[PDB]
Amino acid sequence: DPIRDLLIWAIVQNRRELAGIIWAQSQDCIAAALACSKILKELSKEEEDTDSSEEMLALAEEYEHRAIGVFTECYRKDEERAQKLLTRV
């Protein structure tokens, strides 16, 4: 599938628009955002050390905001399948 790997390609490249633009049509709604957040936080903790680390940490925790938003709207509806969602393989 293209989108799952294109998010991986775009996230390590550190932009605003492209990541969300690609995600807007992601088949895997929840796990891709979590994977992008993890990769991006690791890149934060590796090495930039000035002028970018805090901004792209804010972008990471924005991906956590957005994962919380999608989990909110999937807990709006269909609670049963909502809890079985949390074992996505």
Determine, following the binding rule CB under 8 A, whether residue 13 of this chain makes contact with a copy of itself.
Answer: no
> Closest Cα partner for 6 from 32, 39, 30?
32
| Residue selected from 1, 17, 49, 80 as contacting a copy of itself according to rule CB under 8 A | 49
| Residue selected from 72, 77, 80, 87 as contacting a copy of itself according to rule CB under 8 A | 72
Q: How far apart are CA 19 and CA 46, in angstroms?
A: 20
| Residue selected from 50, 77, 86, 87 as contacting a copy of itself according to rule CB under 8 A | 50
Q: How far apart are CA 84 and CA 1, in angstroms?
A: 23
Which positions touch a copy of itself (CB under 8 A)?
49-51, 72
